Ligand binder design. Structure first.
Ligand SMILES: O=C(O)CNC(=O)C(=O)O
Ligand SMILES: O=C(O)CNC(=O)C(=O)O
Ligand SMILES: [Zn+2]
Ligand SMILES: [Zn+2]
Lengths: 15, 349, 349, 15
């Protein structure tokens, strides 16, 4: 679980 | 000599390609800004070329020459758009200089002492066009860059064009790569000379060039070390702190080791900008207005079984997550740096 | 002058107290090792003194003079113990020097290039005693320190003594502070001059001195910055990298800002060593053998509602957790430092 | 949940 916690990524783009 | 082989393998974007019908070079090297790092050329391939499929699968940049992705949009120019883009508002950024640095407005709070370099103004398309003409007319030095998610409001004919995009091709690409949903199509209309500074995005990007010419410099996620992103909580999160026009090698020494992948895209090219890859984007000097539409897809989901050692982009994800969690856990973004130094000074050098 | 007031407020451990019956000073300042930092004296109070309760509640060190915590154990010495401690094995550490640096043996793998400074040997109590006498007899320079969790095997009379501990007092203390269970009682028998280097523990500690005299130097958790703990994955996790006998101020500059709380404990004193507080412990020069029993309690559980800003020890917990998670997440402890530098170099200075 | 994750502490002592 820990690993996958830190591997999740947001989806932020441009501004 | 291996230096010899290297000095010419930094071909930049190659010799400017000649337009069909013998229309001479579309651009010449003099319209590119001068920078301190070497670059290699992103390959320009046919969409039916398997090598191009191999690059996309491997999350490497490629310029696809013949997708027809936005074929109906190639007739776009300011006059056409103003007659049919509808009466919705468009976000337009204004800058005193040629580097548009952007900001996450929400983050504007925690850091008081950042002062914006370019302001944003909402306006109707026709006002933006007039505002361009004005600046043009009066020989002003102001700079405007329109960037707006294409939304419901767009007029009848712009929707018709949209339906004429090559959804078959890009739909299959979305499938073949397990990508997430398409989140948006960002319309970008730039003044000649406009620069978008080096930054990376948290989505996969097919970058469909429509009018004018954009020089695109890309760096792999493994050059995080050389590019010095703003802290995650900083309004310029995900952009390089390095001023490409005057790099402070004292603050950012590993910028002396950066190597870029480069290309020029013109009307009808699609540039695959892989998720997490840095990109620097400039509308060529004295090239006129530029028009791009991009297609942003959420990236593939994290794999069931993680394979070690981690890829570079996964390490960027991790670092981002560490800064976010310390931010929340400490009650204040502004203690993240202090805690982080306490943690390494004299312990991990 | 405020420097003047400060120069004498570094009273160390005060003037050596005189033993009852006019038996002269039990120790004199000459038996303390010489160090570069100032210290203030930990207060020595009565267990019925409310100030002492105030210190324990606030997780600050205090020396309780009159608990009777281990009153039956004050008759302990080597002869008595050897006749009644039973035939179980005892862990004994051997050192060429007077600093016993310890190691987490399990962590011995990831770092290959650490070489132990003191080895551990299992032996029956009577062998340890003989081994002491030997070294004594032959004027050798070897050093031994016995440290063993008191376990089932101990003889009849040692259990009787154990039951005679003041469980009422310490039981109430456990209650009043919401502490966890008692995990162990560590028996420590030291050669004169023995030093345990600065380290902190992840449990609350009532440190019950039995024979001889131990100088205890404590530092609050908020001086993490000045004390430079080994990386969490390092076998010396939780110890200072600073050699108190020759501090490398180039590597560890903030050690020049460290201020210690200090005391000498003798037979019948109990020193409350709060969880996370650094402690350095030396058996006085030419003081003879020392005997201590400690009582380690799991700390109180994390509070339902967190109150900000965080206390220092909570920040140590956080930092520890960050290093552990990167350790697991990267597949290898040895990438933690590299990732951590990538993360701050030129981003948080 | 995040905060409390990073605030949990082990119980490591001596050696
Ligand atoms: O084209 C530009 O100037 C900026 N666009 C981007 O950074 C992008 O498409 O993701
Ligand atoms: O007494 C010693 O030499 C070492 N003991 C400790 O560090 C402890 O009691 O927690
Ligand atoms: Zn972008
Ligand atoms: Zn200890």
């Amino acid at each position: 679980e820990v690993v996958k916690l830190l591997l999740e990524h947001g989806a932020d783009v441009x501004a | 000599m291996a230096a010899t082989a290297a000095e010419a393998v930094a071909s930049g974007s190659g010799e400017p390609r000649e337009e069909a019908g013998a229309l001479g070079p579309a651009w010449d090297e003099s319209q590119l800004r001068s920078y301190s790092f070497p670059t290699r050329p992103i390959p320009r391939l046919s969409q039916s070329d398997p090598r191009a499929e191999e690059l996309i699968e491997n999350e490497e940049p490629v310029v696809l020459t013949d997708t027809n992705l936005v074929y109906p949009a190639l007739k776009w120019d300011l006059e056409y758009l103003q007659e049919n883009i509808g009466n919705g508002d468009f976000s337009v950024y204004s800058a005193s200089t040629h580097k548009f640095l952007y900001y996450d407005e929400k983050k504007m709070a925690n850091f008081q002492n950042f002062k914006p370099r370019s302001n944003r103004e909402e306006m109707k398309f026709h006002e933006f066009v007039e505002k361009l003409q004005d600046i043009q007319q009066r020989g002003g030095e102001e700079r405007l860059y329109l960037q707006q998610t294409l939304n419901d409001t767009v007029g009848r004919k712009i929707v018709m064009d949209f339906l004429g995009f090559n959804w078959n091709w890009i739909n299959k690409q979305q499938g073949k790569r397990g990508w997430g949903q398409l989140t948006s199509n960002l319309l970008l209309i730039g003044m000649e000379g406009n620069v978008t500074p080096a930054h990376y995005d948290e989505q996969q990007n097919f970058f469909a060039q429509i009018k004018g010419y954009k020089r695109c410099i890309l760096f792999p996620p493994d050059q995080f070390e050389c590019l010095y992103p703003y802290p995650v909580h900083h309004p310029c999160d995900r952009q390089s702190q390095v001023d490409f026009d005057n790099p402070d090698y004292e603050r950012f020494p590993n910028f002396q080791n950066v190597v870029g992948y480069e290309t020029v895209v013109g009307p009808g090219d699609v540039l695959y900008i892989p998720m997490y890859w840095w990109h620097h984007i400039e509308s060529l000097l004295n090239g006129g207005i530029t028009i791009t539409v991009n297609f942003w897809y959420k990236g593939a989901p994290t794999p069931k079984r993680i394979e070690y050692p981690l890829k570079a982009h996964q390490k960027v994800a991790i670092m981002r997550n560490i800064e976010k969690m310390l931010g929340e856990a400490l009650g204040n973004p502004q203690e993240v740096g202090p805690l982080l130094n306490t943690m390494i000074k004299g312990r991990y050098n």
